[PDB]
Protein: Neutrophil collagenase
Amino acid sequence: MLTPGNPKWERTNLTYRIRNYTPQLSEAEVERAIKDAFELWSVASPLIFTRISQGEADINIAFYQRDHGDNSPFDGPNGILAHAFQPGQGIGGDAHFDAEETWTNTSANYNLFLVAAHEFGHSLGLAHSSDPGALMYPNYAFRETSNYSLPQDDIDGIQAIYG
Ligand SMILES: Nc1c(N2CCc3ccc(CNC(=O)c4nc5sc6c(c5c(=O)[nH]4)CCS(=O)(=O)C6)cc3C2)c(=O)c1=O
Ligand SMILES: [Ca+2]
Ligand SMILES: [Ca+2]
Ligand SMILES: [Zn+2]
Ligand SMILES: [Zn+2]
Structure:
């Protein structure tokens, strides 16, 4: 099955909610980084992401520090930047970002957009990739460019799951 053990969403129209923010960026910047991160995946699959302001969305997005209720604590500045749960009900699909990081919209360490795009890959059922140029590669490194789009390896990945 190509990616045994990695769940997938049964529906293509998913909702998401940004539960809180980070002092490092303006609220609009956080919202846009998230929107664009989702767009990277939507343009290469049938996935459609819709934002809600309250209630239970399919994908919860939040900034938390150290222990935050899911037995997968963050580690303070640097190191682990965020993590996301594979597709499923409840915590499934949720993405958490380390609130102790300096979040940016530049090449400066920990560009929210890039981190979120990577995490959403996980929220959608993708595992890490060995392709060093892939968005889902295990190590973060911001590579500035003109137009941002999903590397072909990541397109192969999402297509393999959702078409
Ligand atoms: N591993 C772990 C973490 N991360 C989450 C954040 C994160 C983000 C990204 C990567 C690997 N990818 C990159 O660093 C990266 N990918 C791409 S694809 C792409 C680009 C990039 C890129 O700049 N960096 C930029 C030009 S583009 O035309 O838009 C296409 C790895 C990780 C590893 C943790 O936290 C943790 O534990
Ligand atoms: Ca969820
Ligand atoms: Ca950290
Ligand atoms: Zn968490
Ligand atoms: Zn990852």
In short: The chain is about 25% helix and 15% strand. Helices lie at 27-42, 112-123, 152-162.
